[PDB]
Nucleic acid binder design. Structure first.
Length: 115
RNA sequence: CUCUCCAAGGCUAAAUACUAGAAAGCUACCGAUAGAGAAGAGUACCGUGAGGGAAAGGUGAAAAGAACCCCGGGAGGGGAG
């Protein structure tokens, strides 16, 4: 389905997909200007990560299609998958130890020329 | 009774037990949770010490390891090879 000419992918980003998905829901299908404004405004780590990936996707589309400006572009699809995990130890009382997982996420954004 | 043997001195190869290993070979023996614990080692780690004891093999036929360009602080991705 993907026009892989027009897309950006960010692998192993430092946030959990459970925390990045809602921000993706708020910009899926919006216009590029509106999405960029939302991501700049909202002070969430996932918001900043999506901002980088979305800006890169728009840049790729513009570079390969010179007659496409920032205001014909809308964020067509947005996918947020889960990535590698790292386990570190958190020690507790009575010699008990717990493993403390750190999750990463993959982010895939495709833009498309507006309706 | 008869039949055998002649101690209280000292040696003796071979046939026999064994393979940590060395070389030459074999397997209706194993193929990475298997096989020695260990394809990387009694190392990492645990205990004052005696001692106990892991997990981790694979690009491609050849690095011929992605010139250069774009986004990004990078990472990474999108093109070009």
């Amino acid at each position: 389905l993907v026009n892989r000419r027009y897309t950006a992918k960010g692998k192993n980003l430092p946030s959990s997909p459970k925390k990045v998905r809602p921000i993706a829901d708020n910009i899926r299908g919006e216009s590029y200007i509106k999405a960029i404004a939302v991501l700049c405004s909202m002070p969430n780590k996932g918001a900043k990560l999506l901002e980088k990936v979305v800006k890169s996707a728009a840049s790729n589309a513009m570079y390969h299609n010179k007659n496409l400006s920032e205001d014909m572009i809308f964020v067509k699809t947005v996918m947020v998958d889960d990535g590698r995990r790292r386990k570190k130890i958190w020690p507790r009382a009575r010699g008990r130890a717990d493993r403390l997982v750190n999750r990463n996420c993959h982010i895939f954004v495709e833009v498309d020329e507006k309706k």
